[PDB]
Motif scaffolding. Sequence first.
Motif, PDB file in Angstrom:
ATOM      1  N   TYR A   1       0.837  -1.197   0.000  1.00  0.00           N
ATOM      2  CA  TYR A   1       0.000   0.000   0.000  1.00  0.00           C
ATOM      3  C   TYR A   1       0.875   1.250   0.000  1.00  0.00           C
ATOM      4  N   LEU A   2       1.906   1.225   0.838  1.00  0.00           N
ATOM      5  CA  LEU A   2       2.846   2.331   0.947  1.00  0.00           C
ATOM      6  C   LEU A   2       3.528   2.579  -0.394  1.00  0.00           C
ATOM      7  N   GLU A   3       3.959   1.496  -1.029  1.00  0.00           N
ATOM      8  CA  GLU A   3       4.631   1.567  -2.319  1.00  0.00           C
ATOM      9  C   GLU A   3       3.737   2.207  -3.378  1.00  0.00           C
ATOM     10  N   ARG A   4       2.553   1.644  -3.565  1.00  0.00           N
ATOM     11  CA  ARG A   4       1.674   2.051  -4.652  1.00  0.00           C
ATOM     12  C   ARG A   4       1.089   3.446  -4.445  1.00  0.00           C
ATOM     13  N   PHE A   5       0.654   3.744  -3.231  1.00  0.00           N
ATOM     14  CA  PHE A   5      -0.112   4.965  -2.997  1.00  0.00           C
ATOM     15  C   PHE A   5       0.732   6.093  -2.411  1.00  0.00           C
ATOM     16  N   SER A   6       1.516   5.790  -1.392  1.00  0.00           N
ATOM     17  CA  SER A   6       2.186   6.829  -0.625  1.00  0.00           C
ATOM     18  C   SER A   6       3.520   7.255  -1.242  1.00  0.00           C
ATOM     19  N   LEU A   7       4.223   6.326  -1.877  1.00  0.00           N
ATOM     20  CA  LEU A   7       5.581   6.609  -2.331  1.00  0.00           C
ATOM     21  C   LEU A   7       5.727   6.599  -3.847  1.00  0.00           C
ATOM     22  N   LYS A   8       4.960   5.732  -4.508  1.00  0.00           N
ATOM     23  CA  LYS A   8       5.078   5.516  -5.955  1.00  0.00           C
ATOM     24  C   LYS A   8       6.441   4.913  -6.280  1.00  0.00           C
ATOM     25  N   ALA A   9       7.065   4.351  -5.254  1.00  0.00           N
ATOM     26  CA  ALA A   9       8.403   3.791  -5.360  1.00  0.00           C
ATOM     27  C   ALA A   9       8.462   2.403  -4.726  1.00  0.00           C
ATOM     28  N   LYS A  10       9.671   1.872  -4.588  1.00  0.00           N
ATOM     29  CA  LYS A  10       9.875   0.521  -4.078  1.00  0.00           C
ATOM     30  C   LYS A  10      10.322   0.533  -2.617  1.00  0.00           C
ATOM     31  N   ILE A  11       9.632  -0.250  -1.797  1.00  0.00           N
ATOM     32  CA  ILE A  11      10.019  -0.442  -0.406  1.00  0.00           C
ATOM     33  C   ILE A  11      10.975  -1.629  -0.288  1.00  0.00           C
ATOM     34  N   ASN A  12      12.210  -1.346   0.088  1.00  0.00           N
ATOM     35  CA  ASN A  12      13.202  -2.383   0.338  1.00  0.00           C
ATOM     36  C   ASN A  12      14.243  -1.867   1.326  1.00  0.00           C
ATOM     37  N   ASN A  13      15.451  -2.408   1.295  1.00  0.00           N
ATOM     38  CA  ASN A  13      16.489  -2.026   2.259  1.00  0.00           C
ATOM     39  C   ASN A  13      16.915  -0.550   2.123  1.00  0.00           C
ATOM     40  N   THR A  14      16.424   0.144   1.103  1.00  0.00           N
ATOM     41  CA  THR A  14      16.779   1.546   0.904  1.00  0.00           C
ATOM     42  C   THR A  14      15.704   2.486   1.454  1.00  0.00           C
ATOM     43  N   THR A  15      14.808   1.956   2.283  1.00  0.00           N
ATOM     44  CA  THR A  15      13.726   2.753   2.852  1.00  0.00           C
ATOM     45  C   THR A  15      14.250   3.922   3.682  1.00  0.00           C
ATOM     46  N   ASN A  16      13.715   5.106   3.424  1.00  0.00           N
ATOM     47  CA  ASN A  16      13.950   6.252   4.288  1.00  0.00           C
ATOM     48  C   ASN A  16      12.699   6.524   5.106  1.00  0.00           C
ATOM     49  N   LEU A  17      11.690   5.685   4.890  1.00  0.00           N
ATOM     50  CA  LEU A  17      10.392   5.832   5.539  1.00  0.00           C
ATOM     51  C   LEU A  17      10.420   5.277   6.956  1.00  0.00           C
TER      52      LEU A  17
ATOM     53  N   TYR B   1      10.966 -16.101  10.956  1.00  0.00           N
ATOM     54  CA  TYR B   1      10.582 -15.106   9.967  1.00  0.00           C
ATOM     55  C   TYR B   1      11.379 -13.824  10.193  1.00  0.00           C
ATOM     56  N   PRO B   2      12.425 -13.611   9.398  1.00  0.00           N
ATOM     57  CA  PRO B   2      13.254 -12.416   9.502  1.00  0.00           C
ATOM     58  C   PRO B   2      12.563 -11.180   8.923  1.00  0.00           C
ATOM     59  N   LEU B   3      12.382 -10.165   9.758  1.00  0.00           N
ATOM     60  CA  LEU B   3      11.766  -8.919   9.321  1.00  0.00           C
ATOM     61  C   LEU B   3      12.709  -8.170   8.388  1.00  0.00           C
ATOM     62  N   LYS B   4      12.194  -7.770   7.232  1.00  0.00           N
ATOM     63  CA  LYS B   4      13.014  -7.122   6.215  1.00  0.00           C
ATOM     64  C   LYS B   4      13.326  -5.677   6.591  1.00  0.00           C
ATOM     65  N   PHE B   5      12.434  -5.067   7.364  1.00  0.00           N
ATOM     66  CA  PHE B   5      12.603  -3.681   7.800  1.00  0.00           C
ATOM     67  C   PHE B   5      12.102  -3.517   9.229  1.00  0.00           C
ATOM     68  N   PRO B   6      12.797  -4.118  10.198  1.00  0.00           N
ATOM     69  CA  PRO B   6      12.397  -4.069  11.604  1.00  0.00           C
ATOM     70  C   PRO B   6      12.618  -2.698  12.242  1.00  0.00           C
ATOM     71  N   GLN B   7      13.278  -1.808  11.507  1.00  0.00           N
ATOM     72  CA  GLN B   7      13.577  -0.475  12.009  1.00  0.00           C
ATOM     73  C   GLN B   7      12.372   0.440  11.817  1.00  0.00           C
ATOM     74  N   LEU B   8      11.353  -0.083  11.149  1.00  0.00           N
ATOM     75  CA  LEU B   8      10.094   0.622  11.012  1.00  0.00           C
ATOM     76  C   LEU B   8       9.381   0.652  12.356  1.00  0.00           C
ATOM     77  N   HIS B   9       8.984   1.850  12.773  1.00  0.00           N
ATOM     78  CA  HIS B   9       8.243   2.035  14.015  1.00  0.00           C
ATOM     79  C   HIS B   9       7.038   1.110  14.065  1.00  0.00           C
ATOM     80  N   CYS B  10       6.930   0.380  15.166  1.00  0.00           N
ATOM     81  CA  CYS B  10       5.897  -0.628  15.329  1.00  0.00           C
ATOM     82  C   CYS B  10       4.509  -0.011  15.328  1.00  0.00           C
ATOM     83  N   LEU B  11       3.560  -0.762  14.800  1.00  0.00           N
ATOM     84  CA  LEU B  11       2.192  -0.310  14.688  1.00  0.00           C
ATOM     85  C   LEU B  11       1.528  -0.324  16.056  1.00  0.00           C
TER      86      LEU B  11
END
Length: 123
Positions: A10-26, A90-100
């Motif tokens: 959802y973040l990729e398609r709507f919020s960023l128009k970009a790719k969510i991966n290890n290069t996330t600044n989000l 299950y290894p989290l790909k972006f665990p540095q993302l603030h938890c929901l």
Amino acid sequence: GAMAMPMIEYLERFSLKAKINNTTNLDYSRRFLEPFLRGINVVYTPPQSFQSAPRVYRVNGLSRAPASSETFEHDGKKVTIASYFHSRNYPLKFPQLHCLNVGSSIKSILLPIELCSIEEGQA
């Protein structure tokens, strides 16, 4: 219908128009993603290694600490959110993302938004 969109997707398609991966600044942008995420319903889908039933939670917002930061005492060990999922195999790909921040306002649970998905009925 049947559009249960993973929050990352959802973040990729709507919020960023970009790719969510290890290069996330989000990661650190999660605080400003809060205003958009406040008051949503997300279906928490437990990873295939959990074999647990998916449950929807009303997002009140985000917790101030990422999954690699927050710790809870289990087995007498204070394990990080990210480590617990990793131990569940299950290894989290972006665990540095603030938890929901969901569950309850008096009982907050921190969940990797990666495994949270926006219900089509919310949009």
